[PDB]
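Hi again,

Forgot to attach this to my earlier email, sorry! This is the prediction with glutathione bound. I've pasted everything inline since the attachment limit keeps bouncing my files.
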Amino acid sequence: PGLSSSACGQFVQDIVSSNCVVIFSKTTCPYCKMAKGVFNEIGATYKVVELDEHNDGRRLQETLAELTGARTVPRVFINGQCIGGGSDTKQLHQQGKLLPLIEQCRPCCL
Ligand SMILES: N[C@@H](CCC(=O)N[C@@H](CS)C(=O)NCC(=O)O)C(=O)O
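Structure tokens for the complex follow:
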């Protein structure tokens, strides 16, 4: 394959590839607590990157803006695809559309 054009990009590619569910988050953001919440509800473990605990948080926020079209947290990724923020997470879940997205993630043995 190919390499991203910066460490920011690489990092986002990397963690979004190694993980079914990724939440780029802030510890102080209620929409992030909401999204994390629905995932705990489902019983899906996920990877969190707290951008306010990261020395490069602002640069990562910029990269997520370029990739996903919004800089707001949370930026939620299922199976390499950004599904949007907290309301999207919540709303997909309420419509029973989320668990299927999660179920498309390759299985442990693969
Ligand atoms: N509609 C968005 C709203 C999320 C949101 O407003 N996050 C706030 C903090 S809770 C934010 O991005 N502030 C700008 C920033 O943190 O840089 C969603 O559901 O995720």
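DSSP finds five helices and four strands in the chain. Strands lie at 21-25, 47-50, 75-78, 81-84.

That should be everything now.

G.
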